Amino acid sequence: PLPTNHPTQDYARLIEKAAWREAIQNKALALASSRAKREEILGIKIMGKDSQPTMTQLGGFRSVLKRLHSRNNRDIVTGYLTALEQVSNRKEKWSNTSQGLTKIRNLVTQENLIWNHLDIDFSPLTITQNGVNQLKSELWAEAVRTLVDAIIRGHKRDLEKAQE
């Protein structure tokens, strides 16, 4: 492992972030390709020919999660979930999901949970001393955003395939 004060640590961190980003995105796209994992991670499901919830609820959430730049912004995402479940007309749209609003809240509130779903071994992808902890904190919001977007994309691709 590279000493923390080492002058090439900025360049090493560049290669690490690239390797982690590609690993996260590939593993996300694997997960999102399967109906069972999409339901496992976000609760969203396809019931024959209509999606649970409707794609406008997924678009609504996806337009909120794009504001998750850091763990400090996470109250915006859990804030939005509060206003969803605060009112029955919104709550009832997600209530036909596999517990999706709790699953979304867990994915955003728990810093570990994204990494458990991705289940990537980052030891081959890190070389900086304490690199994993620094990269996990740095890439957490991006990894969450990556996975949620992949799942929603995979869901809507199958949703269209069911309708085509």
Place this chain on the structure above:
Amino acid sequence: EGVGIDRHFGTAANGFKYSRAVIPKGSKFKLPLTFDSQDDGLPNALIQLLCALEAGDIRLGAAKTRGLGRIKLDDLKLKSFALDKPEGIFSALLDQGKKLDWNQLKANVTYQSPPYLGISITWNPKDPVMVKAEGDGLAIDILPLVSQVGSDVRFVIPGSSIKGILRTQAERIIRTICQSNGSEKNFLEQLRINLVNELFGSASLSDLGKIGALAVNDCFSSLSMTPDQWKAVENATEMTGNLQPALKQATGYPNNISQAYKVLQPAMHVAVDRWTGGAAEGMLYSVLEPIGVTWEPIQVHLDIARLKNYYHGKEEKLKPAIALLLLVLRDLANKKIPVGYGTNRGMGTITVSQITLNGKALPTELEPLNKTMTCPNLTDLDEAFRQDLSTAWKEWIADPIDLCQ
């Protein structure tokens, strides 16, 4: 996010959704050019290129015809290093170069563009015009699409949306003149038609692929908001609760709910049961209608040089394409081409105040196109020129052949 529209049913064609990530408007990057001169000057074509960059004439990236790619150059500096000479080599090593005033050379030669016709359409929403935002809001279901424009957000009609409505009207006019039916054909077949495959382009399928000679800008609202002001609207949970502050802020009327709602108006829609007369609850939905959003003029660019290459330089073939383009602009000015969401549902009709036709390096026979029109029926165009176009148009109609040979 976007979708193809089936030409027979008028609805989102199955399998023709698309998504594209875009660097936002107002983003900056360096002009990063070095030129090695082998003679004691600066080349004309390179001076012309820099003038074109300052004019905004050069497009970069994907979706050039369908909303994107426009760039403009500012802060242009030219530094000279006489590498033929000791003073210039040591200047290159040490002194950051001899400054050229660009304004001198830029004045000392005429800028020459390749042929194009600019169309600038001054328009206003006759009824609220919006593209739908893909996500529902909390208080409002159907929200206007916004985009980042510099440090602000503005409401946007993507040039993809204006392109597709114009393409649809072009194709409808041709299929009427031919009495050709697109009900049987699939979406890709429904698009392949003569004169529209050149003005709007054909998909590159192995090749009939063509880029459109006609390019449409993203049209942004004259209104703008801070990003957190719009998030306050998106996050608003109650239509008569925290939405009213958020809309008052975003429209710029924090103390006047009347003036705020003359710009952005929340609208409820309810479906009524036919047997009982009851609100078919669950079929209640809400739209934030941009009733008083002012918009910048629609910028359409016809690449006349692109058409010439398709028609093999002979400008007589241009006249049927120009004729179609004018017939489409006549429909756009006569409110026959609604734009965006909800066009049969109370939105999307536009007024056209003015069409400015701004040709650069046009051929003499199309030179009457250099005009500002305010009659919707194009009677500001010379009648001898419109009859001239009308004759070439009628000849093509008689044999609706593929110009492009």
Place this chain on the structure above:
Amino acid sequence: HNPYNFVPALPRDGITGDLGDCAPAGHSYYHGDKYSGRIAVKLTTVTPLLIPDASKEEINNNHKTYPVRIGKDGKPYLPPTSIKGMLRSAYEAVTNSRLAVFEDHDSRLAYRMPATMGLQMVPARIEGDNIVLYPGTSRIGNNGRPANNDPMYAAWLPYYQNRIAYDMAEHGDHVRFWAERYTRGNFCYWRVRQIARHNQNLGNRPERGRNYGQHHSTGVIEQFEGFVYKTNKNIGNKHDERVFIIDRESIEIPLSRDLRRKWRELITSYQEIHKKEVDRGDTGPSAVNGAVWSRQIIADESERNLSDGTLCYAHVKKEDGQYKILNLYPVMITRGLYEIAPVDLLDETLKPATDKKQLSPADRVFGWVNQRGNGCYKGQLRIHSVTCQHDDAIDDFGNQNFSVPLAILGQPKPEQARFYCADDRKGIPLEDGYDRDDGYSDSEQGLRGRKVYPHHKGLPNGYWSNPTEDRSQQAIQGHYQEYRRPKKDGLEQRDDQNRSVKGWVKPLTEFTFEIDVTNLSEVELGALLWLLTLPDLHFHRLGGGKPLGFGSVRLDIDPDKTDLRNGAGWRDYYGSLLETSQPDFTTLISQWINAFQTAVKEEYGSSSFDQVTFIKASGQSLQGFHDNASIHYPRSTPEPKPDGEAFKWFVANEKGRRLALPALEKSQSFPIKPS
């Protein structure tokens, strides 16, 4: 006259033409034989028009006050979607199209069953996949009543007027108890004397009980096991809960899915009808103070489920030599269900379309999205450019802070079968005098059709003037200001039953709008232009408060701004960049309207167009009623009383002549006393 009625929706089997179901013309080109272009429409209001701005609704004491929606110029913004829905429903009437909005009519509807029906119910418990009857010491008579004046099937647990605590029992307690046979009137019952949980010992045999007023002891004393069936003190005379005497006699009967889905529908009715009441925090029935909500109403979703060990009443009869269980009920005198769901009373040719091959005329003209599948169609008709021509068009009744409180706009209650059910599929009213059980009863019955609000003909001068004055307690020319809530004790009844408007669009104010239409056939165009060129004094009904009289409007085409051509005419138009003649549609409008009229005659079997039943009915709606009987909701007094007691007419009707809502074509008025 009732403020609504129905144009009958006729079944559309063998309808073969443009009025039939058809593949839509499409949007790809202007067909040479079908007409496209712009119709300019002048709309002028005849009565005041309500255009609520829900985006600016003020709310106080849960009463909502709506201003008029205004556009960027401050003139009233009449929304194109509001005109579209007015036009669509009127179009869909006169073409006999599918019903575009037919939502959530697949459950049976619920109503109060006869009070005599409670005698026919036996205590029951579900035990697994069986409902098991528990008649106790008595035996089930053939009609379902306790046979030959043996005692009531359940013990009576004195709970309120006299109290028998253990040695207080709750619903579903398994209990062991002494009971004594007690007598009142024509009947007798087992009075619980003392009670214990099933594990405990109930003690020695009690002696002769005290006569409790008119309840007289017989001295015949027994002990039983049972379950206490408790419902709360849920009507005023209630004294006793029930104990289902399990110990003595029993009959297991299969619990079919139909019984359990009836129970779900019945209990969801009980719950949903009071959801607003219990959210308001009300503790008891809407017209019986001091009573408390009955258990199944306050119980959760689990009450709908009819899970193992739950207790019910079974309506039973010994027909054909078997104990037939008709229905399961939560109380002795109960809500029950009509036999048939309203979705089964509407023909499949009249239900909303579910395939592109089955698009009706209004699905083609106004467009369609499949609600139960894939499929959609863009409308061939576009309303746009709605411009108010008058500037001072909005009446604010003196100040921007004034408002008129509107009369209560209640929910439509299709469960009143005499108003919403038809006696056949061609939309005839139910016959008068029949039992309420006779609505929604037969598959050969039908729905009344499309609900419409006939124009309030003959409103007197000044009826709408100065509306902040309460004039409703006084006849003026025989009208009683139906649009306004009455005063109560001199103060305005602004509550959550009604709404207020800060203003309305004045009568005689003019709007212009345009209709853009694509590829209409002459029949489809004829229907539309017929609606846009109705004879004098025919009015469309627009916006809100239509049953109060608001929103009657006159539509007529502005011919100079109208430009309709067939695709051959458009082919000539696009054939030139020079100005070209437009064909004068005014020479052809009669042809198209007659094309529509002859198609309606020919496909719907009539020797005249105006004698087609849906045409005849629809005309009467647009025209109103010529007999100068006032339009108002039914009530027992000619004056609208300041209390919401209009149900009193309906209960008088139920005990009286039992009038159905008269056919719209017949123009028959209701009597103020239907006794």
